[PDB]
């Protein structure tokens, strides 16, 4: 909408107080004008007709409850854009600064959050395996490296190029929880997930099998379910992600860590130059290898590290 930007004042779904860009005409409405060509946050009002409105408040005030998943999508949203701006002058999903979407409140007990081709879509949580997942920055930053894959390697959602597909987005999420640096970690999901069980996450990228998930090539999954175990499978890229930038001794081979920043430069560098629709996990780890030789040399420890990350989940 045209108007003039605001910054209005809420709290989030953990209870923490937050500003938040909004824009002014009538109402204050969740529009960001400071990033790109827009941030916005609609209010799908429990039905699953999408967008929804965008989101209209009386006094700039985000402090009620319904307020709250709206809060954190809507901010969460502009942290994961300045990280990639900052980080890997990347300008939105799109390269071009493609006005990003939100919407919450979808569903009822929806225990999920997706990219629908166009926009991000949160659901509420049933309130026992999740709360409104926006809550979660991880979560957040994982939605929406799904639309930069879309608009990047393309990465089919199936199989092994589908686990690839998830890996990225936990990756991506977990870079940009540290980049913020409020309680970060290489867990995913662990501030919306299960609020009567402390202590756990969704999914682990330390330790996958944590969750019953594969750290090792030899335990793929390779039956139908989850879209040929694209949850699942991603545990073993998530593996290797982790162990470049951490270090470890995996099934008795020995990662040399390079840290968080290296591994995302790697990284995006693979997903933006190397990728396609169809790569499989020995296809990535070429194109890591390769992104590491392009921005490290190939004799460099980034390059052997990457290549001992992939040997330690067998992957060749
Ligand atoms: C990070 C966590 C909390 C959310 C994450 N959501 P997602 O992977 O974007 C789904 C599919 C489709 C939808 C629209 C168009 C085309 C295709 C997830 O891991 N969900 C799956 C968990 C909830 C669990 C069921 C494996
Ligand atoms: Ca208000
Ligand atoms: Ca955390
Ligand atoms: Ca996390
Ligand atoms: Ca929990
Ligand atoms: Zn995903």
């Given at each position: 909408i045209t108007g003039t930007s605001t910054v209005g004042v809420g709290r989030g779904v953990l209870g923490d107080q937050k500003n938040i860009n909004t824009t002014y005409s009538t109402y204050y409405y969740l529009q960001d004008n400071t990033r790109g060509n827009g941030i916005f946050t609609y209010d799908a009002k429990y039905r699953?007709?999408?967008?929804?409105?965008?989101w209209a408040d009386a006094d700039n005030q985000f402090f009620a409850s319904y307020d709250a998943p709206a809060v954190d999508a809507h901010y969460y949203a502009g942290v994961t854009y300045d990280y990639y701006k900052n980080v890997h002058n990347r300008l939105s999903y799109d390269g071009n600064n493609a006005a990003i979407r939100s919407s919450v409140h979808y569903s009822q007990g929806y225990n999920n959050a997706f990219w629908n081709g166009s926009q991000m879509v949160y659901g509420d949580g049933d309130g026992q395996t999740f709360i409104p997942l926006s809550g979660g920055i991880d979560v957040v930053a994982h939605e929406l490296t799904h639309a930069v894959t879309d608009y990047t390697a393309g990465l089919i959602y199936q199989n092994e190029s589908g686990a690839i597909n998830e890996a990225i987005s936990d990756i991506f999420g977990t870079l940009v929880e540290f980049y913020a640096n409020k309680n970060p970690d290489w867990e995913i999901g662990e501030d919306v997930y299960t609020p009567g069980i402390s202590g756990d996450s969704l999914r682990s990228m330390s330790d996958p099998a944590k969750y019953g998930d594969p750290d090792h090539y030899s335990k793929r999954y390779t039956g139908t379910q989850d879209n040929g175990g694209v949850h699942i499978n991603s545990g073993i890229i998530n593996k290797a992600a982790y162990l470049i930038s951490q270090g470890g001794t995996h099934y008795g081979v020995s990662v040399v860590g390079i840290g968080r920043d290296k591994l995302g430069k790697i990284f995006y560098r693979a997903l933006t130059q190397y990728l396609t629709p169809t790569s499989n996990f020995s296809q990535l780890r070429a194109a890591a290898v390769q992104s590491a030789t392009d921005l490290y040399g190939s004799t460099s420890q980034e390059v052997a590290s990457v290549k001992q990350a992939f040997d330690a989940v067998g992957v060749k």
């Open positions: 699953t007709t999408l967008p929804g409105s965008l």
